[PDB]
Enzyme design. Structure first.
Site, PDB file in Angstrom:
ATOM      1  N   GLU A  35      58.305  11.167   7.400  1.00 49.55           N
ATOM      2  CA  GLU A  35      57.554  11.949   8.257  1.00 49.55           C
ATOM      3  C   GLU A  35      57.123  13.367   8.769  1.00 49.55           C
ATOM      4  O   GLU A  35      58.570  13.721   9.144  1.00 49.55           O
ATOM      5  CB  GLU A  35      56.844  10.668   9.229  1.00 49.55           C
ATOM      6  CG  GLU A  35      58.231  10.753  10.157  1.00 49.55           C
ATOM      7  CD  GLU A  35      57.675  11.659  11.241  1.00 49.55           C
ATOM      8  OE1 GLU A  35      57.578  10.494  13.065  1.00 49.55           O
ATOM      9  OE2 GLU A  35      56.986  12.353  11.705  1.00 49.55           O
ATOM     10  N   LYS A  86      58.084   1.389  16.963  1.00 50.56           N
ATOM     11  CA  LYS A  86      58.680   2.287  17.040  1.00 50.56           C
ATOM     12  C   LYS A  86      59.149   1.610  18.569  1.00 50.56           C
ATOM     13  O   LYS A  86      57.729   1.657  19.177  1.00 50.56           O
ATOM     14  CB  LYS A  86      58.381   3.482  16.757  1.00 50.56           C
ATOM     15  CG  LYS A  86      58.592   4.636  17.371  1.00 50.56           C
ATOM     16  CD  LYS A  86      58.311   5.794  16.896  1.00 50.56           C
ATOM     17  CE  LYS A  86      59.053   7.049  17.568  1.00 50.56           C
ATOM     18  NZ  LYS A  86      57.951   8.253  17.504  1.00 50.56           N
TER      19      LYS A  86
END
Lengths: 270, 270, 142
Positions: A33, A122
């Site tokens: 990402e 996360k």
């Protein structure tokens, strides 16, 4: 995705995106990402989707606004990572069939993210909290929610995050800092893949060991209880010899032949 | 007879027969014989049959002639012991329903005695041959023939005769020598009963130990073979831990609870 | 027979007889016997006679009764070994042209066995007596 590591390339520029992403993928990563606070991300991201979208989970980080999700969908983003829990960001990204791994730091925030449809979490920044924090969170989280440590994860400490219950990790500055060489990216990515696979292997070995290990206990208890049964019939077996038989036979050095063992047990029945 | 020891009172006189026999019986003997080379045995024997015939197996030794068997039957002798194999002596004594324990020293002589109807054998003198001689003879004798060591058997060595396969022993000079006190007879008879029962107890304990001991081997082999099965499925269990489980549980110090053990094995199946 | 060693396989079972006998023969033995106190000897013995009878002296041990000799002859036994001297066992086995090696332990017993037609003697059990015992017996034996 095969290996549960996310390459986070904060501050990468469009002209270097392809090379650095190719490095991480070549080393074994299959999720990458680019944070939206990277310069000209709307050039880098669609480029990497097109070169690598069919080789790795490609997406974006630091996604803070619903309208960014819309733009990223059009670019062919498959993955949305965030530093925070923002319900409509998560709902919108989920709504595109994208994989969302949003960032939370407390129990309350984690359950908000799940209610928004998040399938993974996360913990950010993990470094302040430590592996034990996640272990504590995992005691209340639904069993199938994948937890990713992000923040101060190193190839050296990765093991401890995986041990604590993390399904994987997002790696930022320790993998890529803006302006490092492609060679450094390939080096750090190799280190993390090695650490995961070595660490994962160690964990698997430990699990195997544990599985082997109890087996004994159940047989030891079985025997202990059989003895107590024998004792009530007036039979008191020499305990050291019993263990010596187990050891010797297991080591292929039984002082009795298989036939002997069998005729002795029959005689013992009598 | 309860205890397989024969008291042999060679050279005892009629006036002392009752006291010495009462001594041995009181100490635990239930077989007694007076050799026919004892003075005035035809007075002593019928006396002891009458006083003790219902308390012990009473009979005669050094029976060398068929006509002596006839005389002894009339006296109420229940037991015939000999130093030699003489077929008609054995057949005649058997013919009265008396217990015969005739004396042989070789394989050939033993099988002659069996063919004459002997149900038990005396190895005489055992001292020259040793326990191993009997062990060797027992490998060819029918399983149910009782073998008695006679000759140089002591309360100290009795154990080794019983270990070698003797069902019991006939005790002569080491128990009674002509002209010793009644107190000495009670002392030696106590020693032999103690040695038998202590020795017999030791043998029983050894047998119990052996019976316990193999059990382990069969379980050790069981595990060894299960491991090899697991290995072919790509599972390699830590061997020391397996043994540690057996030991800990047996000692009531398993590091896993019974519930843990059970859920771990289920997980191992998976 | 070439090498004067007799393999005695006491307590061997029918399913293992062929392999163990093949082992001893392969190593150099050419006399083998199965004691009659072995389980199912009337299966093992005829099997070994048939597999090995032309490669080694095959027979039986612990032969105690004349009627066993008869049965063993029919099975093709070539060798009779005993723990004891029993004159009719020896005479009967000799009568079939079988090799007899009967067991004795004294001078008197040895001469009885010879008179029954024995051409060889087994001193059993030799361990109790020792080599010198045999040396002493050999000073009177033919």
């Amino acid at each position: 995705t095969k290996l549960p590591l996310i390459a986070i390339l904060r501050g990468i520029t469009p002209d270097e995106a392809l090379a650095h992403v190719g490095a991480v993928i070549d080393a074994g990563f299959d999720a990458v990402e680019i944070p939206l606070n990277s310069p000209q991300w709307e050039q880098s991201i669609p480029a990497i989707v097109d070169a690598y979208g069919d080789k790795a989970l490609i997406g974006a980080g630091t996604v803070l606004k619903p309208e960014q999700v819309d733009a990223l969908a059009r670019m062919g983003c498959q993955l949305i990572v965030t530093p925070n829990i923002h319900s409509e960001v998560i709902r919108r990204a989920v709504g595109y069939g994208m994989t969302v791994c949003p960032g939370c730091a407390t129990a309350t925030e984690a359950f908000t993210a799940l209610e928004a449809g998040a399938q993974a979490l996360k913990i950010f920044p993990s470094s302040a909290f430590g592996p034990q924090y996640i272990k504590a969170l995992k005691a209340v989280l639904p069993s199938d929610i994948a937890v990713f440590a992000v923040g101060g994860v190193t190839p050296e400490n990765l093991a401890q995050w995986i041990d604590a219950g993390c399904a994987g990790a997002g790696l930022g500055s320790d993998l890529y800092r803006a302006g490092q060489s492609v060679e450094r990216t390939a080096q750090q990515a190799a280190a993390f893949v090695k650490a995961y696979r070595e660490a994962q292997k160690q964990k698997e070995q430990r699990q195997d060991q544990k599985s082997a290990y109890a087996l004994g206990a159940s047989l030891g208890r079985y025997m202990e209880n059989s003895l107590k049964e024998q004792e009530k019939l007036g039979i008191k077996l020499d305990k050291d010899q019993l263990i010596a038989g187990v050891q010797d036979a297991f080591a292929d050095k039984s002082k009795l032949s298989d036939q002997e063992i069998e005729q002795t047990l029959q005689a013992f029945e009598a």
